[PDB]
């Protein structure tokens, strides 16, 4: 599942709720360290609410398992991610994933 790990936590208390735009500045990765996504270079923080089924459930479960100001090292799996189909042209079949997540705010 979302075998969460922390990097530099903050309060450990301000967990997210329903209808809360988690303002993330994540930096995704792949196994064997081959990068596949980012947000630090765009300078465009992500924004997504809980329960709206916008994102794969890995990010949602990682945010629910996370407090504010909490840099982290998430670890999803093919079960929650694109699976044996795989996102075409980027993700191959049956790929584990890594994310240097960092939540900042909620609106």
């Amino acid at each position: 599942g979302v075998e969460i790990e922390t990097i530099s936590p903050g309060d450990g208390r301000t967990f997210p709720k329903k209808g809360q735009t988690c303002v993330v500045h994540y930096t995704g990765m792949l196994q064997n360290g081959k990068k596949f996504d980012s947000s630090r270079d765009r300078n465009k923080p992500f924004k997504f609410r809980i329960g709206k089924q916008e994102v794969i459930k890995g990010f949602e479960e990682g945010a629910a398992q996370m407090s504010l100001g909490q840099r982290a090292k998430l670890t999803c799996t093919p079960d929650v991610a694109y699976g044996a189909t795989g996102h075409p042209g980027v993700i191959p079949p049956n790929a584990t994933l890594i994310f240097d997540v960092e939540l900042l705010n909620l609106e």
Partner: protein
């Protein structure tokens, strides 16, 4: 037919091709040489500390770098660029290595969990201690005096290694060795030694930047030629017998 074939060439993806630009870092060390030959040993238990202020990406990417876990120079050299381990031309690069950065040991991009409560990076105002263990490798560090267990075995110490520190930009820290220059907030524990004991004559010890080929030269371009180490003959001091 073009859109058919365009959407058909892409999802192969073993054809598709990868690049990853990397932060430019550089190592550092003091003027001490390890030089521990077996037969006339001096001190197989050393200790020094490091103190830090800031590790912020003020205008940078946050993918920064700070390690002190010793690397095999039988496996590594002081070069500015290269290596199939995503570069990161600093400490813990070579696969026969590790690296302490608060939370983990990334043994050539192999994350190995370190046993310590209150896991966090080398944040502002957090001390980092070092020790020595050779005959059965369990090489110890500590952060603010707390148990950093699960230390590392089978890193190649067949002989010796080299003392190091690595850093990326946006960094401001201070060595701690001894005298005025070491205000040891965590003393040497039993069977250790504040590592300023080999302060040899003819020079006050200082930093060296890991035998750099050329610093930021400005007057002209100085081909600062081959100085392999303190001794072209070997890497060892001379107990006369």
């Amino acid at each position: 037919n073009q859109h058919l074939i365009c959407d058909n060439l892409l999802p192969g993806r073993d054809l598709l091709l990868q690049t990853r630009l990397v932060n430019h870092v550089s190592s550092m060390r003091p003027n001490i040489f390890l030089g521990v030959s077996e037969g006339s040993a001096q001190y197989k238990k050393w200790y020094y500390e490091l103190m830090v202020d800031h590790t912020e990406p003020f205008v940078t990417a946050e993918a920064t770098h700070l390690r002190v876990g010793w690397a095999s120079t039988e496996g590594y050299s002081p070069y500015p660029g290269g290596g199939e381990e995503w570069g990161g031309n600093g400490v813990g690069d070579d696969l026969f290595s590790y690296g302490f950065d608060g939370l983990h040991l990334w043994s050539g991009c192999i994350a190995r969990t370190v046993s310590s409560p209150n896991q966090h990076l080398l944040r502002t105002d957090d001390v980092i201690s070092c020790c020595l263990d050779l005959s059965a490798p369990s090489i110890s560090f500590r952060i603010n005096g707390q148990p950093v267990q699960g230390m590392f075995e089978n890193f190649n110490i067949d002989g010796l290694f080299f003392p190091v520190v690595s850093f990326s930009a946006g960094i401001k820290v201070r060595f701690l060795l001894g005298g005025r220059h070491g205000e040891f907030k965590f003393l040497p524990p039993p069977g250790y030694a504040a590592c300023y004991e080999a302060v040899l004559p003819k020079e006050k010890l200082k930093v060296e930047h890991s035998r750099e080929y050329k610093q930021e030269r400005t007057y002209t371009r100085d081909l600062l030629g081959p100085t392999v180490s303190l001794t072209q003959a070997a890497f060892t001091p001379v107990p006369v017998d």
